Design a protein around this ligand. Structure first.
Ligand SMILES: OC[C@H]1O[C@@H](SCCc2ccccc2)[C@H](O)[C@@H](O)[C@H]1O
Ligand SMILES: [Mg+2]
Lengths: 1014, 208
């Protein structure tokens, strides 16, 4: 066993492992099978095991096979051993975590030795077959039972089963399992995720009788309009064939039996030598079946019984059946004859405390949040999931892409192993065992051959294998340029809507152009788009506009669902969120492990609301007084839907109402609004509509909002003058300062810097820092890309801004003058920002302080045409005071940016100061609100047309701090008020992705603010 | 076409080295306010007049064709000299062929004689314009000719136009696109419409 080194040989992937099959419980009662009750024949071995860690498999003492080591600890199974402190988890994206030298692995190969002592019932050993099932072990393992060697397995993400009938004794039995971190199977598992190890899914014992059901498959066929179905069930047995053996398949809808069939064994003739004596095929007719879809997940229950002709049951098995048909016809992917639009997301199995151990409670929480945010589909990135996941997607309704555990991203070239016939055996076990496990699940609609492994002849061979054994689902594969002969669907990753990226050999065309290339007929579904790393999803609306307009663009899967951060503890035992490199792991890919729409504890990022709104199932159009509502449901009528409408004048409600929705799938409804009020007061009128679900569902509460939209109606411009004040502000001119007094208010302008340096109400100072121009932001993850201090990427935005001096530029005063008018004081300033003799920006300002005590600020900025476009053009200061609440009239309530603001609505918003900070784990610019007309904070009020952010953290502190737990609140409050702000991008995060219409490239800018004390 | 300007404010102030005039106007039609413009004129000791303009457009009125100033100058000169896109007529959605340079043409080349008279002869992207003793500086679009916008709108054939006394100048901060995907339905794309609600531009008028 130490001399064969099976873990360094790609030709050996298992020894003594049993055939793959759909999930079995071996019920001995037909009613228990029908109702899905727990089976006495399936025991869990999850719980406390003994565990010892070793640096290599040669360091494991020989006594460990016979008895427990004294130095072993007690640990919970399932678990990852890096989550218990035995060695460090490693976060690496592309580079393999070991030397690339296939098929050898390091001689330092951390080894986990697990053991369990357990009782077996007397009844289990007299008759039948006892097997052990390991649902997942990472990465390869050898198994012993009572000191004797049983078998060996590889592939971390599919179950491994072994017959223990010959090894078990009555009384106390002992299992010993030796798990290796690295194996030749590690070469095929280079997914972008934490690299961990252990017995990380369930362990169980199953008892079957000697004559047994060994496999069964369920298939459904329809007539042209889905009014008649045939359920075809193939059953195979093992053991001794007898003439008295019979198989019955019955189909249940709730407690009503719908169809039934019975036959003896013996298939029809297949070839010159006969047929399968040990198989049978039943056909069951079903009239007007209820169809399964993500909108209405109607399920039936199929029970399969092996019994004698005189009626004695031997064993029963069962599964959930959904009647649906998936096909590609004339370049469109169809479900039940209608074209799908995929609102998809990629999801990893990740928990911040338990690593890669999934429980039911976590899975249900992810499914409810997905459906509540208008997702209908999920991609298993990038391996088969825990078996309970597919059951939940069947019951709640999500389309699943099921993916083989094959990724060789770090190879050079990427197809070095997948073009080699010596690795064809290892790859075929990963594809064929996934299909034999999952082919009965209705939620699985597409198979995938894996991810990022180039294009090799091995992929073509396996594409054709699946089409032949399971013709009822399309196959997709992205490697080798996303449109090879190994895919039914064009499935690019990160292709842009309008812009081509012409890389050699593997170009990423714009998605609209890809469709129409000479010869191309397939549908296009992006397997990854809109990389959600940090403050991201800019330009998301542009994908959804294209998906709705082009029939053959059928949607895509966002990258991705949840941040893969882990929890660490500081000195005081306070938890904090950690990422690549925080465990001493090296090399590592730092914060690239956090790409989620939700934080690792399942709290939402602000981008989640942008996804929910673009993916809505109702679309709205306004024409005069008429709202047109269009349904994008394919199958359901809107029977749980109420339309609420509200008209408001600059935040104040004027009229409201509700109307029930009655709209057929893909239909329209016209709603006529009552004669709207005509107010005399100035301001913009706004109409907001929202779709509300009055009743609770399996996945949502009563009152859930599923869709919304907002429009401008009539506007009345203000033609009244400000009330003529009696008091005149007084100007005092020293050598150092201009000082303006009016009543208890006082303003001070510094004549050497040319900035407002202080302001008094009574005797209380209002500023800690002067009001100054600001042209920079703390860089987002999309601004940095793959750039680092070792290896600078000169094309990233942060690198262009640094090389040009934007972070270092010094303001030089050109002019600072004051003048008394009739009723006001006017201050005029000009500044130039320079770096090594080059002028980057010029700003010219006027400040007008009138008798009402208002200060009107006008700003004019010029930007040199050859400097990189600036991140923002605005003012900043640090206010002296801290208030509890922020009140504003503008887009809200959540963080919104110029290329991510469709989901935000214009209204009067009011939040505690802490909701104005988004706590991204990697700190950056955050919390901006756009389209704002008025902002109130303490005694201050700003009016204008601006974007702002307000918080306790300076742009400087956000840029210098790598983790959110290291930030500290500064004295007072930092306010940033911008006339203009650049987009955030997010098509990908490793190349510039801010579209030309969101860059500040106009050269001249103007904005105005009024600062008063109300 | 019918809206009347109503005065809201007209004030003057002596600064240290300049005189400042501030005005505001509202354009109305049957009680509805369509546009508001607020202007400052600053006349300094060099004899330059700096004009700042801020315009608001009601969100529910159809987007305007232009936002600019016009006047009729008393004098007729032979040549027009400008630094901007040229030498031929160019508009915001038809200006790729034009190049930025110093251009100089007789006044008659600044008029395009379309058989059905219309707005014509605009030059975009202009930084400086010289005509007789006058010079305008800024970042604007202009057209200069012997025919008013009113006369071009009322006359159906180019042979019926007559030169007016002096020269009509139009200086625009902003101008809508001309379209032309077809001519029997609206065809000006959304990025060429003046839909931003608030506009700002500035000019210097001097005598060089
Ligand atoms: O979340 C990161 C993404 O990285 C890029 S590689 C290019 C970017 C990169 C390369 C190397 C290190 C870090 C990032 C992959 O194609 C995506 O599937 C996803 O894993
Ligand atoms: Mg990868």
């Amino acid at each position: 066993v130490l001399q064969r080194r099976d873990w360094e040989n790609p030709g050996v992937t298992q020894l003594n492992r049993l055939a793959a099959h759909p999930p079995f419980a071996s019920w001995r009662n037909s009613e228990e099978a029908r109702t899905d009750r727990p089976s006495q024949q399936l025991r869990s071995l999850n719980g406390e095991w003994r565990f010892a860690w070793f640096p290599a498999p040669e360091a494991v003492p020989e006594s460990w096979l016979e008895c427990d080591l004294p130095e072993a600890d007690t640990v919970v199974v399932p678990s990852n051993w890096q989550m218990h402190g035995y060695d460090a988890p490693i976060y690496t994206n592309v580079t393999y975590p070991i030397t690339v030298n296939p098929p050898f692995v390091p001689t330092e190969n951390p080894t986990g030795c697990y053991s369990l002592t357990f009782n077996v019932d007397e009844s289990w050993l007299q008759e039948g077959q006892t097997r052990i099932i390991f649902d997942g072990v990472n990465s390869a393992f050898h198994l012993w039972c009572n000191g004797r060697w049983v078998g060996y397995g590889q592939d971390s993400r599919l179950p491994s089963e072994f017959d223990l009938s010959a090894f078990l004794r009555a009384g106390e039995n002992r299992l010993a399992v030796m798990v290796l971190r690295w194996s030749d199977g590690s070469y095929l598992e280079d997914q972008d995720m934490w690299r961990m190890s252990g017995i990380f899914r369930d362990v169980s014992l199953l008892h079957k009788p000697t004559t047994q059901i060994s496999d069964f498959h369920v298939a459904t066929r329809f007539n042209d309009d889905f009014s008649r179905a045939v359920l075809e069930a193939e059953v195979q047995m093992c053991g001794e064939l007898r003439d008295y053996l019979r198989v019955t398949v019955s189909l249940w809808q709730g407690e009503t039996q719908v169809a039934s069939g019975t036959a003896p064994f013996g298939g029809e003739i297949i070839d010159e030598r006969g047929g399968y004596a040990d198989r049978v095929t039943l056909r069951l007719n079903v009239e007007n079946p209820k169809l399964w879809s993500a909108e209405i997940p109607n399920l039936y229950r199929a029970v399969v019984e092996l019994h004698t002709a005189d009626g004695t049951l031997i064993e029963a098995e069962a599964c959930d059946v959904g009647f649906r048909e998936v096909r590609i016809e004339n370049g469109l992917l169809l479900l039940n004859g209608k074209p799908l639009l995929i609102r998809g997301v990629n999801r990893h199995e990740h928990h911040p405390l338990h690593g890669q151990v999934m429980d039911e409670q976590t899975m249900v929480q992810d499914i409810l949040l997905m459906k509540q945010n208008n997702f209908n589909a999920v991609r298993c990135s990038h391996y088969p999931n825990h078996p309970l996941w597919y059951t939940l997607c069947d019951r709640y309704g999500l389309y699943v892409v099921d993916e083989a555990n094959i990724e060789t991203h770090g190879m050079v070239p990427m197809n070095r192993l997948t073009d080699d016939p010596r690795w064809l055996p290892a790859m075929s076990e990963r594809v064929t065992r996934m299909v034999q496990r999952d082919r009965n699940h209705p939620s699985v609609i597409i198979w995938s051959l894996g991810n990022e492994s180039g294009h090799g002849a091995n992929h073509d061979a396996l594409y054709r294998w699946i089409k032949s054994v399971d013709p009822s689902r399309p196959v997709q594969y992205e490697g080798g340029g996303a449109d090879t002969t190994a895919t039914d669907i064009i499935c690019p990753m990160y292709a842009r809507v309008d812009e081509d990226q012409p890389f050699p050999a593997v170009p990423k065309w714009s998605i609209k152009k890809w469709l129409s290339l000479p010869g191309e007929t397939r549908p296009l579904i992006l397997c990854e788009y809109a990389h959600a790393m940090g403050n991201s999803l800019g330009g998301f609306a542009k994908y959804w506009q294209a998906f709705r307009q082009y029939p053959r663009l059928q949607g895509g899967f966002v990258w991705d669902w949840v941040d893969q951060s882990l929890i660490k503890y500081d000195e005081n035992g306070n938890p904090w969120s950690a990422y690549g490199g925080d465990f001493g792991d090296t090399p590592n890919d730092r914060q690239f492990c956090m790409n989620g729409l939700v934080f690792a504890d399942r709290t939402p990022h602000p981008a989640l609301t942008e996804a929910k709104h673009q993916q809505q199932f109702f679309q709205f159009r306004l024409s005069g007084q008429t709202i047109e509502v269009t349904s994008e449901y394919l199958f359901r009528h809107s029977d749980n839907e109420l339309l609420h409408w509200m008209v408001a004048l600059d935040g104040k409600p004027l009229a409201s109402g509700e109307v029930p929705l009655d709209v057929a799938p893909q239909g329209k409804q016209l709603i006529e609004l009552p004669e709207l009020p005509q107010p005399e007061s100035a301001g913009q009128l706004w109409l907001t509509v929202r779709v509300v679900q009055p009743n609770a569902t399996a996945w949502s509460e009563a009152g859930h909002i599923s869709a919304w939209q907002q429009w401008r109606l009539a506007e009345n411009l203000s033609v009244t003058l400000p009330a003529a004040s009696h008091a005149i502000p007084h100007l005092t001119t020293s050598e150092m300062d201009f000082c303006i007094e009016l009543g208890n208010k006082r303003w001070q302008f510094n004549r050497q810097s040319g900035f407002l340096s202080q302001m008094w109400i009574g005797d209380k100072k209002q500023l800690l820092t002067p009001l100054r121009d600001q042209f920079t932001r703390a860089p987002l993850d999309n601004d940095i890309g793959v750039s680092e201090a070792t290896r600078i990427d000169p094309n990233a935005w942060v690198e262009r801004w640094k090389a040009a001096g934007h972070y270092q530029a010094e303001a030089a005063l050109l002019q600072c003058t004051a003048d008394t008018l009739a009723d006001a004081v006017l201050i005029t300033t000009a500044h130039a920002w320079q770096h090594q003799g080059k002028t980057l920006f010029i700003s010219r300002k006027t400040y007008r302080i009138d008798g009402s005590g208002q200060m009107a600020i006008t700003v004019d900025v010029e930007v040199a045409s050859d400097t990189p476009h600036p991140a923002r053009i605005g003012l900043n200061c640090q206010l002296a005071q801290v208030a509890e609440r922020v009140n504003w009239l503008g887009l809200g309530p959540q963080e919104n940016y110029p290329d991510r603001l469709t989901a935000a609505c214009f209204d009067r918003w009011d939040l505690p100061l802490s909701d104005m900070y988004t706590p991204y784990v990697f700190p950056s610019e955050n919390g901006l609100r756009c389209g704002t007309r008025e902002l109130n904070y303490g005694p201050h009020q700003w009016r204008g047309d601006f974007q702002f952010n307000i918080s306790r953290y300076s742009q400087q502190q956000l840029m210098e701090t790598s983790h959110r737990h290291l930030l500290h609140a500064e004295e007072g409050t930092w306010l940033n008020i911008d006339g203009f702000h650049m987009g955030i991008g997010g098509d990908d995060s490793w190349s510039p992705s801010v579209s030309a219409e969101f860059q500040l490239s106009a050269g001249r800018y103007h904005y105005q603010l009024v600062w008063c004390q109300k």
